[PDB]
Amino acid sequence: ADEERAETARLTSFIGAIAIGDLVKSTLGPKGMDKILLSSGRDASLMVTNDGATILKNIGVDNPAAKVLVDMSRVQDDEVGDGTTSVTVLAAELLREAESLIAKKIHPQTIIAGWREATKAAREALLSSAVDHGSDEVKFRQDLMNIAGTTLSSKLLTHHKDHFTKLAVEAVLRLKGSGNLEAIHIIKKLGGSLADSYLDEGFLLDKKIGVNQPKRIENAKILIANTGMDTDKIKIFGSRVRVDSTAKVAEIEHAEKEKMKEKVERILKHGINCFINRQLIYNYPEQLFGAAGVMAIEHADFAGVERLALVTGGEIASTFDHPELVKLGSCKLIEEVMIGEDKLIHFSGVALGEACTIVLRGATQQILDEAERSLHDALCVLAQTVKDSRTVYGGGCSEMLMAHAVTQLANRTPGKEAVAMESYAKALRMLPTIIADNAGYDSADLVAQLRAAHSEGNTTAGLDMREGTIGDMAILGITESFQVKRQVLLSAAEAAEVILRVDNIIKA
Amino acid sequence: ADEERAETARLTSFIGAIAIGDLVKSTLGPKGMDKILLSSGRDASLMVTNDGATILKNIGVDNPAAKVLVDMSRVQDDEVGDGTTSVTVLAAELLREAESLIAKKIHPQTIIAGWREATKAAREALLSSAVDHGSDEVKFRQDLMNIAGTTLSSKLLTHHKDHFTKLAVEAVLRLKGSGNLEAIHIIKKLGGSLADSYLDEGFLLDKKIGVNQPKRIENAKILIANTGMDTDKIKIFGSRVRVDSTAKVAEIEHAEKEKMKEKVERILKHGINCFINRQLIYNYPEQLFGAAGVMAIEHADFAGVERLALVTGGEIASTFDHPELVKLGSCKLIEEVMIGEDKLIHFSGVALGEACTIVLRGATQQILDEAERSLHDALCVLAQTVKDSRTVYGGGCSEMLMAHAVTQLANRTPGKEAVAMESYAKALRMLPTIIADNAGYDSADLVAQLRAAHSEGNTTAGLDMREGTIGDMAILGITESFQVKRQVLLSAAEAAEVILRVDNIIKAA
Amino acid sequence: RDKPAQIRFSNISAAKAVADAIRTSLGPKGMDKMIQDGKGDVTITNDGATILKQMQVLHPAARMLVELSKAQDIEAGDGTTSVVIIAGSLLDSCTKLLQKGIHPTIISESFQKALEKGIEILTDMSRPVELSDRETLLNSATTSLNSKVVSQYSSLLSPMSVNAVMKVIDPATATSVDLRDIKIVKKLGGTIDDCELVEGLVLTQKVSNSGITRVEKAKIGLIQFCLSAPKTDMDNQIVVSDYAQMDRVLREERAYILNLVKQIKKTGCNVLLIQKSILRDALSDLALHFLNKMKIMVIKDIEREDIEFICKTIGTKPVAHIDQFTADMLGSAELAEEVNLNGSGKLLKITGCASPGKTVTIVVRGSNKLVIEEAERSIHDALCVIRCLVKKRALIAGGGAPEIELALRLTEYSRTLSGMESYCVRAFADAMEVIPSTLAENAGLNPISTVTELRNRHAQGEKTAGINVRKGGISNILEELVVQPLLVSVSALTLATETVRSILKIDDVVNTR
Amino acid sequence: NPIQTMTEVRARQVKEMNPALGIDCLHKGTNDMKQQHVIETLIGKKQQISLATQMVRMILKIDDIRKPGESEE
């Protein structure tokens, strides 16, 4: 085996995490620098990134400390929303200050307990600074617009951002808590609209309906089933052998065409005119369905169907031999619409209630995917604001305030961890220096004055560093919720500490 | 020849300063670790010191920025006395913290300008940490004691230290209402024991003449004079040298003989029993004094002969410009006694009873010389502590309290000045960490505890490096004066800002 | 760390150095390349535009140059080499400012502010021609033709272009008209004289034999089905193990198909166009010969382009199997023409098609494969120049002469702007003046003297005159037949400003594992 | 910062001419030259402009870049 000894393990732990750290720190905060990721080792391309998820996963980890952090932060992004950039940058900034400590010669446990007690002080001070702005529900709507506005910007979107502020706030608000990929289902397609997204009333499905199957169904009763034939159905009188010589290769193919007709009669028995199967068949099998008069709609989504099922009292579940096994969903018309310039089969009959479907229109697939991830993190933050409608002023204003409170306690409270409580405070303030020079303000000057102001009780004024200026955060709206920040702080301190604890790495 | 651009200049400057700061951080304070002095360029003999001052003079430095540190150290020795090592360490510390600011993007002026405002805040803090003590005679004794014991240990001599501390504080104590040293003679003299030491209440010339001349005078009358006998101070009664003959060599020797004697007569005409002369007394006038009834002391000091003139109530003749026309001094008694294995002349009944002589008694020359200096630095301190009778709580207790003062200021501020405030507090605080190593007790625990006290507001716990723990300070034998400390803070800063400001170092070597 | 400083300096060095080589543009300059590849093939290149699209690089910063050219073609179709060279100017700006201590995020910001002001000043100097008016369109089209290879086939080409774009057009100054509607087909045979503009939709395909419908009436076929016949998709119980038994199965298979194609004709089909990808063999290779007999057109293994155009314009949708009869969701049609012309060429024209009020097709003809190529490039640029006016109108100086002109007007606006951004933009004004300079420099020997001189002659003419870049001589450049569309130079600035900005934005090494 | 402070004064050059408003030269938060109280003689600044220009004119004169290796001894 390989043994990487006591100094050296800690050095690998610091540089590795610093390098990955510097990738997500540019996008983080107000507009400053971005990442444009350079791909050559998998494939030769350039990629336009702004989400921390893309940046961190796509570049491997081959430095053992680096692995742990990218995994903890990725899961935090799903739950918390915006945990990808936030957790990784702070964890990296803390290791830098460990580097200092250790050469000086402070033991790793002093550092670990100093950072930890200092996290407890930060959390207590974040609670202090956070105050309600959801005490009337219409005032609550507005609080949510600010929080939403902040996430969305400093992620490249052309005009899809402007819709999404209002969108996310509507979706979360009505539902109350929980997930919100059930209260707004994200269908992504290209349209003639360059970067516009709207609320569909119904579920609409991409695929042209050709042939003898008619494009307008009137009086739909939908039979929901999640499985079906891929293109051929096997059954009791479906199983045969017809292939064993070279001419017999075409005869079995004949036979498979026949197996398609057998599946049609299965639905015909039910008498349910709209059958949904989740998989696509080909154009040739489609003629059989349309002829019989029990129409097959293929390439269906689970998410769309789920939208209809909730309003009508249907059930989304497989098994069909009769329609009494699986409850029915309803729509009036399933009519071929053209939206954009792409021809769509559109289910219309019910609107809203427990779910909407949102149809995004771009011209690049990259825009849709990018848009979903921005939006996603937002919906998660807004989910948490329903529970705790406190909100705390940021932009880097929060991070200095907690740091001031941690510096005060850093002098008084401990017996040896003083140096380490301060190091924790200085690492929160590292994030507001980096963004200052991108903005065109002096890093040193920013961190040293306003920090005393906002702490004394001018919590409103904070860091507007997309212009390099002091602005009101209640009026400019660079304020995020209490919850999202509390949890990424927790996460980042733990993650650094885990790899700070490591004094030998053995590789076997 | 070479033009060192501002950054490149910074590094040479820093490394200069720092190389020096290591030597004096180790020497620091009563438990501080020694230096080895190495005589360079000539031989390679050695002496061991614990004095920061001596490191610089003996062993020089060719780094331009480090030369500024040497000039600074000179100023402490005389004016303040103690603090020669204490300053040099802080100045190197200030620069160390400077390093990270020049790198970042931050210009040298930013760091300077904010440490000036910080020095003013630290001074206000030195006044707060300064509590009055030694207004009354009882407290006044206790007050000199603490400072004086500090000085000796830090500049080497810690074995026979306590005996000398009693005599030194008593000496300053007599003066009362003035910080003289212009009556407190310092005599270091071969003979005696290292344990014994003596303070004569009067004035004492250690110069003797044997038992072959008078030395017992009651109701003495003093003439203080500078009279040549071969030097040939004016009031000539001899001849010019001229050469006219081959036997002329004989004529010169005779002519000197009438000279020596005619001057004895003019002295004699004062009506005196005790005659003191800075210059030589030839074998011929010496015998003529012993016969006249007049005491002869030859080879008197330039400091002591003058200083004698004030106390006794005489007046000096000044190159023998007063042969009968200068007023006398008076003492009750002149006794010759044996103190040690020496013969001393003891002036007692001196007119201004302020006057005292502190007589240091060596029995190893290495100790006797080092002792004279360290004790002189201590007496410089003592006399400034007359002008303002107050102490600050030493030990690292003040350094933390200045650091903290400046930390609360630092917090308020978000400008260009604010930057350096963070640096300045850290610099002051970095001195007890050195004191902590010197104790031999780990720095991180002590300094962090100390930090905690002073935030809340307390100057009644300091660092005891003599117990290795965080302890009380209640004017113990380990506090420092206000006098030493104000000057040490001011100079460290002032030196560092001059080193910062010089970055256009053109070396033509 | 040290990873952000060194990457920015090299990437900028590495694109810029290639952009120096590449800048030999306009007219005859530099020395030819015969190229020994990294794979050992002999390749010969000429023309700046054609090279840049083709260019095969693996340096992330240099790839930006390849793709910059392609976007330009799609919006303008003019200025494809131009947009790269001026982008290299912006890179020249970026180094000098790093030394000054202006941070990289700041240099990005300034590009936007350079763009916003610059394009407004381009619109100011421009003389606003109408985009629906033929006379001015006709002059402008001559400008682009006469700057390309043609100088005698130019005569034919100018008027066909004004007519073609007129068919697709929309009245506004907003973005309309595309080469997703302008369909460009080649045909062997005909001459540059005989090139034909059909206002409807004509598709390029190959049709078996000669002897087929060239008359009116058609139902246009968009099918996605394979036949049912013995040993196809219908049952046979005759299993072959002999040449004779093979012969029987194929005979009965082809026979049933002869019946089938009559039901295809019953529909009205005189055009049928088969799907791209089989569902077994599609309509069999036997079916195609039988279809030919009914008088009905073929193409199996159809190109991608045809499938997109048919459905969109004519509303043509897939139809059911023939034994089950066709669903009749097919569009309207009235012409099935197999275009033969000077003994060669196979083509489908669809006239009386339904339209959305767009979609023209030009047929490009030439008696020899090179002679088609010569029509093709020249027409492409002439269609595109008139196109650029509908999307956004007006005429400014051409050849990239207003980027030199723009430099004078623009310095002034930076000084009075008096920002952080002013210095970045002022320095770019001086860099746009290098473009005729740098072009010449590389060719020969003695560089310095000529280089300074071309900037004097253009500048001194003032805000309305300078040196021309297609005739030389200090004369009025704003209208004199050295013009290009507003769209071409504003588009070029825009694309450049985005791609370059991106190099500044990165920090630290990045390489996916 | 050098860039930031230069930018500040340049703004007030477009807004108003012949300024008593230059950069800080007492190390202040404010920037003037009436409240930083630096004044030069008009001739004094005038003489600088001449001199700087001068240096350029002297290096231009001859074309003797020829050296035997003697050119700074």
Question: Cα angle at C226 between C220 and C230, to 5 degrees?
Answer: 130
**How many CB atoms neighbour CB C82 within 10 A?**
27
Q: Which long-range contacts (CB under 8 A, 24 or more apart) does D27-30 make?
A: D27/B109, D27/B113, D29/B415
Pairing of strands B329-339, B217-225: antiparallel
Q: C486 by DSSP, 3-state: which?
A: helix
**b/e for A424-453, b at 16 or more Cβ within 10 A?**
bbbbbbbbbbbbbbbbbbbbbbbbbebbbb
Coil, strand or helix: which one is A280?
Answer: coil
- Neighboring chain C residues of A60 at a CB cutoff of 8 Å: 512-513
Q: Pinpoint the alpha helices (H) of B274-325.
A: 283-292, 302-312
Helix (H, G, I), strand (E, B) or coil at A333: strand
- The CA distance from A416 to the nearest CA of chain B, in Å, is 5
- Joined together, the tokens standing for residue B484 give 């030493």
C46 burial via Cβ count (<10 Å: 0-12, 13-18, 19+): exposed
Chain D contact for B501, CB < 8 A? no
Query: Would you call A351 an interface residue with chain C, using a CB distance cutoff of 8 Å?
Result: no
Tell me the chain A residues in contact with residue C232 when contact means C-beta distances shorter than 8 Å.
Answer: 250, 254
| DSSP-assigned letter for residue B508 | -
Contact A448 B106 (CB under 8 A): no
Nearest residue to A309 (alpha-carbon basis) of A264, A268, A265, A354? A354
Measured N-to-C along each axis, helices A418-439 and A84-104 cross at an angle, to the nearest 10 degrees, of 130
User: Which own/partner contact pairs does A1-5 have at CB distance under 8 Å and 24+ positions apart?
Assistant: A1/A506, A1/A507, A1/A508, A2/A506, A2/A507, A2/A508, A3/A504, A3/A506, A4/A504, A4/A505, A4/A506, A4/A507, A5/A504
Query: Which of A34, A44, A212 lies at the smallest CB-CB distance from C327?
Result: A212
CA distance A359 to A371: 12
List alpha helices for C59-103, DSSP H: 63-75, 82-100
Residues present in chain A in total: 508
- Integer Cα distance of C256 and A237 in angstroms: 29
Q: Which amino acid is at C99?
A: Q
Contact (CB, 8 A) for B446 and B463: yes
Q: How far is CA B406 from CA A448, B114, B419, in A?
A: 13, 11, 12
Q: Yes or no: say if B331 and B310 are a contact pair by the CB < 8 Å rule.
A: no
Contact A208 C318 (CB under 8 A): yes
**In chain A, positions 249-288, which contact chain C (CB-CB < 8 Å)?**
250-251, 253-254, 257, 282-284, 287
Chain C: touching chains (3 or more CB pairs < 8 Å): A, D
Across the interface, do B109 and D27 touch by the CB < 8 Å criterion?
Answer: yes
Nearest to A376 by CA among A87, A78, A47, A60: A78
Residue pair B357/B182 in contact by the 8 Å Cβ criterion: no
Sign of the CA dihedral running B432, B437, B440, B444:
positive
Does C82 show up as a binding residue in the annotation? yes
C-chain residue closest to A37, CA distance:
C510
B83 labeled part of a ligand binding site: yes
Q: Output the CA torsion sign for A166, A169, A173, A174.
A: positive
- Residues B109, D29: C-beta atoms closer than 8 Å: no
Q: Is B344 exposed, middle or buried (0-12, 13-18, 19+ CB in 10 A)?
A: buried
CA angle A315, A318, A323 (to 5 degrees): 65
Cβ-nearest to C505 among A34, A40, A341 = A34
Mutate which: A59, A215, A283, vs C, most C CBs within 10 A: A283
Cα–Cα distance measured from residue A331 to residue A205, given in angstroms and rounded to the nearest whole number: 14
DSSP readout, A420-448? Answer: HHHHHHHHHHHHHHHHHHHHTS-HHHHHH
Would you give the DSSP letter of residue A508? -
Q: How far is CA B31 from CA B270, B434, B450, in A?
A: 57, 11, 19
Judged by phi (left if over 0) then psi (alpha if -120 to 50, else beta), residue B261 lies in: alpha
Two structure tokens written together for A423: 């190091």
Pick from D3, D12, D17 the residue to mutate for testing the C interface (most C CBs within 10 Å).
D3
Q: What is d(CA A262, CA A255) in angstroms, rounded to the nearest whole number?
A: 11
Q: Is B330 annotated as a binding residue?
A: no
Cβ contacts of A452 on chain B, cutoff 8 Å: 411-414
A217 touches A295 (CB < 8 A): yes
The separation between CA D7 and the C-alpha centre of its own chain, rounded to angstroms, equals 16
Concatenated DSSP letters of A297-310: EES--HHHHHHHHH
Burial of A458 (0-12, 13-18, 19+ CB in 10 A): middle
Picking from C260, C328, C320, the residue whose alpha carbon sits closest to that of residue A283 is C320
C334 with C351: CB under 8 angstroms? yes
Q: Which amino acid is at D69?
A: G
Interface check B418 vs D, CB under 8 A: no
Q: How many CB atoms lie within 10 A of CB B11?
A: 12
CA–CA gap between residue B499 and residue B391 (Å, rounded): 31
Asked if C43 and C35 touch (Cβ cutoff 8 Å), the reply is: yes
Question: Which two three-digit tokens encode residue A175?
Answer: 């539902």
Separation CA A451–CA B67 (nearest Å): 41
* Pair A309, A288: CB distance under 8 Å: no
Q: Are B193 and B164 in contact (CB under 8 A)?
A: no
In Å, what is the CA distance from C183 to each residue of A363, A502, C202, C273, C354? 20, 66, 8, 18, 16
How big is the CA angle at A156 (ends A152 and A157), to the nearest 5 degrees?
Answer: 75
Helical segments of chain D, H only: 2-15, 42-60
Q: Hey, is the C-beta of A244 within 8 angstroms of any chain C C-beta?
A: no
The breaks in chain C (C to N more than 2.5 Å) occur after none
By the 8 A CB rule, do A362 and A340 touch? no
Shortest distance, CA B87 to any CA of chain D (angstroms): 28
Backbone angles phi, psi at A330, to 5 degrees: -140, 150
Distance from C-alpha of C280 to C-alpha of C226, rounded to nearest angstrom? 7
Does B433 qualify as catalytic in the annotation?
no
- Are A452 and B416 a contacting pair at CB < 8 A? no
**Chain A closest CA to C439's CA: distance in Å?**
29
Name residue A357's beta-bridge partners: A185, A200
Describe the strand order of the beta sheet including C348-350 as a list of residue ranges: C201-203, C348-350, C333-337, C214-218
Distance CA C308, CA C304 (A): 7
Q: What 8-state DSSP symbol labels residue A454?
A: H
The conformational region for residue B77 under phi > 0 = left, psi -120 to 50 = alpha, else beta, is alpha
Angstrom distance (rounded) from CA D12 to CA D19: 8
Whether residue A442 lies within 8 A of chain D, CB to CB, comes out as: yes
Q: How many helices (H) and strands (E) does chain D have?
A: 2, 0
Which residues sit opposite C396 in a β-bridge?
Answer: C484
Q: Is C412 on the interface with D (CB under 8 A)?
A: no
Residue C449: beta bridge partners? none
d(CA B142, CA B400): 24
- SS3 (DSSP) at A152: helix
DSSP element (H, E) containing A357: strand A357-361
Residue B148 CB neighbours (<10 A): 27
**CA B157, B161, B162 angle in degrees (round to 5)?**
170
Give the residue from chain A lying closest to B411, CA to CA.
Answer: A452
Q: How remote is the C-alpha of B441 from its chain's centroid?
A: 31
* DSSP designation for A341: T
Q: How far apart are the first and last CA of chain B?
A: 7
In C394-435, where do the E strands start and end?
395-397
Query: Considering only CA atoms, which of A190, A172, A189, A173 is closest in space to residue A181?
Result: A172
Gap between the Cα atoms of B393 and B401, Å rounded: 10
B113–D27 CB contact, under 8 Å: yes
Residues in chain B within 8 Å Cβ distance of D29 = 415
Residues of chain C found within 8 Å of residue D4, distances taken between Cβ atoms? 420
- Which of C24, C81, C313, C438 is catalytic? The answer is C81
Is B415 in the D-facing interface, judged by CB distances under 8 Å?
yes
User: Coil, strand, or helix at residue C65?
Assistant: helix
Query: Which chain D residue lies closest to C97 (C-alpha atoms)?
Result: D3
DSSP string, B262-275: HHHHHHHTT--SEE
Q: Which of A84, A150, A165, A385 is catalytic?
A: A84
Whole-number Å distance between alpha carbons of B213 and B284: 13
C48 is in an annotated binding site: no
CA closest to A439 among chain D residues: D4
Is C418's CB within 8 Å of D4's CB?
no
Q: φ, ψ for residue B3 (rounded to 5)?
A: -115, 115
Resolution (A): 7.7
Q: Which amino acid is at C380?
A: H
Q: Is residue C80 annotated as a catalytic residue, yes or no?
A: yes
In angstroms, the CA A393 to CA A133 distance is 11
Q: In what order do the strands lie in the sheet with A131-132?
A: A131-132, A390-393, A479-481
Residue C234 DSSP label: B
State how far Cα C20 lies from the chain centre.
25
Helices B64-75, B6-27: inter-axial angle, 10-degree rounding: 40
Whole-angstrom Cα distance, residue C428 to residue C501?
Answer: 13
Q: Which residue of B has its CA nearest to D26?
A: B113
Residues of chain C neighbouring D2 (CB-CB closer than 8 A):
101
Helix or strand or coil: residue C198?
A: strand
Q: Which residues of C368-400 are buried (b: 16+ CB within 10 A; e: fewer)?
A: eeebbebbbebbbbbbbbbbbbbbbbbbbbbbb
Closest residue of chain B to A417, computed from CA coordinates: B448
A222 near A329, Cβ under 8 Å? Answer: yes
B touches which chains (3+ CB pairs under 8 A)? A, D
Q: What is the DSSP secondary structure assignment for residue C319, as one 8-state letter?
A: -
C322 within 8 A of C263, measured Cβ to Cβ? yes
Q: How far apart are CA A286 and CA A289, in angstroms?
A: 5
Torsion sign across C-alpha atoms A276, A277, A283, A288: negative
Q: Is D4 on the interface with C (CB under 8 A)?
A: yes
Q: Is C100 on the interface with D (CB under 8 A)?
A: yes
Work out whether the CA dihedral C363, C369, C372, C376 comes out positive or negative: positive
The dihedrals phi and psi of C35, each to the nearest 5 degrees, come to -125, 125
Judging by DSSP bridges, how do beta strands A196-200 and A333-339 pair with one another?
Answer: unpaired
Q: Can A51 be counted among the known catalytic residues?
A: yes
Query: By CA distance, what is A442's nearest residue in D?
Result: D1
**Cβ-Cβ contacts under 8 Å, D1 against chain A:** 442
Interface test with C, best of A25, A37, A38, A295 (most C CBs within 10 A): A38
Instruction: Pick the closest to residue B215 from B289, B291, B271, B294 (CA basis).
Output: B294
Nearest CA in chain A to D1: A442
Q: For B273, list phi and psi in degrees, rounded to 5.
A: -120, -20
How many angstroms separate the Cα of B234 from the Cα of each of B224, B229, B301, B409? 16, 10, 20, 67
Quote the tokens at residue A220.
């739909």
Check: CB of residue B401 under 8 Å from CB of residue B125. Answer: yes
DSSP result, B231-249: S--SS--S------STTHH
Residue with tokens 């996460």: A491
Element containing residue C265 per DSSP (H, E): helix C243-267
DSSP single-letter state for residue B39: -
User: CA of C360 to nearest chain D CA: how many angstroms apart?
Assistant: 55
Token digits of residue B419: 């930057």
Residues A98, A334: Cα–Cα separation, whole Å: 63
Question: What radius of gyration, in Å, describes the C-alpha atoms of chain A?
Answer: 28
From C418's Cα to the closest Cα of chain D, the distance in A is 5
Q: CA-CA distances (angstroms) from residue A81 to A85, A394, B16, B168?
A: 10, 16, 53, 74
> Facing residues of B505 across strands?
B4
| Per-residue buried b or exposed e for C309-337, using 16+ beta carbons within 10 Å of the residue's own CB | bbbbbbbbbbbbbbebebbebbbebbbbb
Tell me which chain B residues have a C-beta less than 8 angstroms from the C-beta of D25: none
* Of the candidates C400, C429, C495, C493, the residue with the CA atom closest to the CA atom of residue C64: C495
> Is the CB of B105 less than 8 angstroms away from the CB of A444?
yes
How far is it, in rounded angstroms, from Cα A346 to Cα A339?
10
Instruction: Decide if B444 and A106 are in contact by the 8 Å CB cutoff.
Output: yes
Annotated ligand binding at C352? The verdict is: no
The question of whether A88 is a catalytic residue gets the answer: no
Is the Cβ–Cβ distance between B374 and B161 less than 8 Å? Answer: no
Alpha-carbon distances of C413 from C96, C116, C117, rounded to whole Å:
21, 11, 8
Q: Give the contacts of A295 (CB within 8 A, at least 6 positions apart).
A: A213, A214, A217, A273, A274, A275, A289
Report, in this order, helix, strand and coil percent for chain C, each rounded to 5: 50, 10, 40
What H or E segment, with its residue span, contains residue B450?
A: helix B443-456
